[PDB]
Structures are given as structure tokens and as C-alpha cells.
Write a protein that binds this DNA or RNA. Sequence first.
RNA 1: GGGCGUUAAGUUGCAGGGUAUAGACCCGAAACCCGGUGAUCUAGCCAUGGGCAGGUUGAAGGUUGGGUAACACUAACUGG
Length: 88
Amino acid sequence: SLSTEATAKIVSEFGRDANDTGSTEVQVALLTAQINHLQGHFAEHKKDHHSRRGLLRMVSQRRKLLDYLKRKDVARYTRLIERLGLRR
RNA sequence: GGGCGUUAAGUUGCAGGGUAUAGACCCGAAACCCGGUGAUCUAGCCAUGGGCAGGUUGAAGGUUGGGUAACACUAACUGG
Ligand SMILES: [Mg+2]
Ligand SMILES: [Mg+2]
């Protein structure tokens, strides 16, 4: 689950202060950040089915809570995906 | 007693009739063996030079976009 140090960086700008660790902005950011790095892990290995199963949770959850906010505070999303990368 | 002999002139030439060896009345095989001449046709190969109007289809490969959590996937265009 990446480094205990890491994510320290990403709570800023996304969050209003450090240890504001629960804004939906950050977890999404935490998830993507892992996922992205973590796609390297499945390049090599790749027949590591089990590890993948955990991945999709990250992806499922990410997407599930990326949909939550779509209902609350409009364009509190259109100010973060492009800020990050993903709307495919 | 028996068998074969003694009682029957031969021989050397010349001509003829046969026969033996020879091609041995004449013509005639398909073949067998020896030694030469042939890859200017043709089979294959070896160098060295030529030839294939015109019209199709459109593999791999590349680029881009869609698609994926990432892949798969898919669309043009390019390519030949
Ligand atoms: Mg562990
Ligand atoms: Mg010749």
C-alpha cells in the first residue's frame, strides 16, 4: 500500500491542511496514485490473480465515491479529475 | 568247339561322285563384343546478360481516435 511516508505529499493542495485525511478528494488521490504505480506490478508477474482482486476494490471504491460527490457540490469534481488525469 | 584272320593285288597320278575342315549354294535377323564420334535437339547443373503492356485485390508494419483501471477490443488513414 505504497509508503507510509508517501501520501504525505498528496494530502496538501487536495486537502485544506495536512491530517485532513478524509476529504473525498484525497482518498481518490491516494487510490489513483497507488493504482497507477501498481499497474507496474501487474506488468511483470501478471499471473498474480489474487493481488489484482485487491486492485479492483481500489478501482471500484474510487469510482463508487467519485460518484458520491457528483451528487453533492457540483464541479467539486470537474476541479479534480483533470487535476489528476482520469475521465477517459 | 567258338570269335577274328589265312582262300580275295596293290599303289601313284588324272577326271568325276560323296564326306571332314573351312563362310563351303546365295541373300536376310532381332542381337553379342571391341574401339572410337556425339549435350549445335533434348534432361540436369555452372558462369554471365536479357524479359514480364494494362488492370485488381490490400497481409505484416506505422499513425491517429474510440475503448479499458490497465490489457484485450475496435475504427479510420497510412503502408504495399
Ligand atoms: Mg502487508
Ligand atoms: Mg546449351
